Amino acid sequence: SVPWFPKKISDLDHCANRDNVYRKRRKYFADLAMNYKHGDPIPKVEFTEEEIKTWGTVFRELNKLYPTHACREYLKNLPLLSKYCGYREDNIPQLEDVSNFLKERTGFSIRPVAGYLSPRDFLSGLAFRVFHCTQYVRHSSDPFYTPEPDTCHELLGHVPLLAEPSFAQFSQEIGLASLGASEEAVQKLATCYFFTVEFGLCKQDGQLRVFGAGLLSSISELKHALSGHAKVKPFDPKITCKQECLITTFQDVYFVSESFEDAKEKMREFTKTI
Numbered sequence: 001s002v003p004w005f006p007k008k009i010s011d012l013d014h015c016a017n018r019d020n021v022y023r024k025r026r027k028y029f030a031d032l033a034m035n036y037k038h039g040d041p042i043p044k045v046e047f048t049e050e051e052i053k054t055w056g057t058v059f060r061e062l063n064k065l066y067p068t069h070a071c072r073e074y075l076k077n078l079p080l081l082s083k084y085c086g087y088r089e090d091n092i093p094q095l096e097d098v099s100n101f102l103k104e105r106t107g108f109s110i111r112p113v114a115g116y117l118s119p120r121d122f123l124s125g126l127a128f129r130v131f132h133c134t135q136y137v138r139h140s141s142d143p144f145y146t147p148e149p150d151t152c153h154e155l156l157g158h159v160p161l162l163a164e165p166s167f168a169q170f171s172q173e174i175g176l177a178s179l180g181a182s183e184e185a186v187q188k189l190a191t192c193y194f195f196t197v198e199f200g201l202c203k204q205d206g207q208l209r210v211f212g213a214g215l216l217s218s219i220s221e222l223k224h225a226l227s228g229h230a231k232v233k234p235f236d237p238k239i240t241c242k243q244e245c246l247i248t249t250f251q252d253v254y255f256v257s258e259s260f261e262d263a264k265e266k267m268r269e270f271t272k273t274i
């Protein structure tokens with residue numbers, strides 16, 4: 001039959017909840033997400049000195065790389081976020097501020113999330129231009145890479161591209177295609193999402209650039225992706241969807257899209273086939 005799926009933005013309420021000082025702090029963030037209901041302003045957080053320091057390292061080092069590494073669309077939106085959302089080395093932007101910024105730019109909004117959602121639930125949010133974002137910060141011991149998404153990843157990796165109309169359309173269309181889809185169809189869409197939105201490369205003016213959020217938030221993998229000691233293949237949904245998504249490590253392959261326009265067109269033809 002058809003699995004349950006959200007029919008309106010508020011329906012995401014029904015799925016978005018599915019050392020030791022660090023553990024209590026993570027519990028603090030998890031509770032903020034769990035207690036959140038659509039319509040609420042997203043709770044603003046007073047980040048600790050250690051948290052801000054970790055952000056600062058990530059922010060400072062990544063901004064050295066972006067001009068030569070990030071796609072043009074990313075670079076176009078990054079300064080607007082400094083101006084309007086408080087993106088500075090000494091300040092961690094608030095999810096509420098960035099959500100409101102996105103709402104005016106592309107209709108995207110943010111919802112705080114306690115941890116990992118199922119691909120089905122995560123993608124369902126995108127259908128309504130809702131991006132589920134973590135609020136906690138990377139453990140201070142490794143600013144260069146983290147196996148789990150943190151707020152640094154959401155804010156530096158995802159947000160600047162969600163502010164771009166062509167990318168927001170591409171993202172929503174993955175979400176829309178997933179709604180009520182088979183288990184097999186969701187996995188293929190989630191893999192395409194992973195190798196574009198999370199870890200994608202694109203060719204711009206003949207050169208390789210990165211648009212993958214998971215690359216754009218990792219000092220170490222961003223350098224690795226374009227080094228180039230990594231394997232790169234063309235983005236092709238029927239091939240890309242079979243690729244294993246790696247966690248805990250750098251990816252073993254990166255897929256190259258021609259443009260956000262082209263990636264969207266390839267996804268449109270592919271979703272008809274499944």
Ligand SMILES: Nc1nc(O[C@H](c2ccc(-c3cccc(F)c3)cc2)C(F)(F)F)cc(-c2ccc(C[C@H](N)C(=O)O)cc2)n1
Nearest residue numbers: 116117118119145146147148149153214217218245246247
């Ligand atoms: N969208 C997505 N998926 C990830 O993992 C996938 C994943 C998919 C589904 C689940 C899942 C969770 C809960 C229930 C369920 F059924 C499935 C968990 C992880 C998979 F394992 F497939 F690769 C991992 C990430 C990710 C993880 C970490 C980072 C941080 C980055 N490396 C950095 O250092 O900034 C950026 C992105 N993003």
Ligand SMILES: [Fe+3]
Nearest residue numbers: 149198213214
């Ligand atoms: Fe992500």
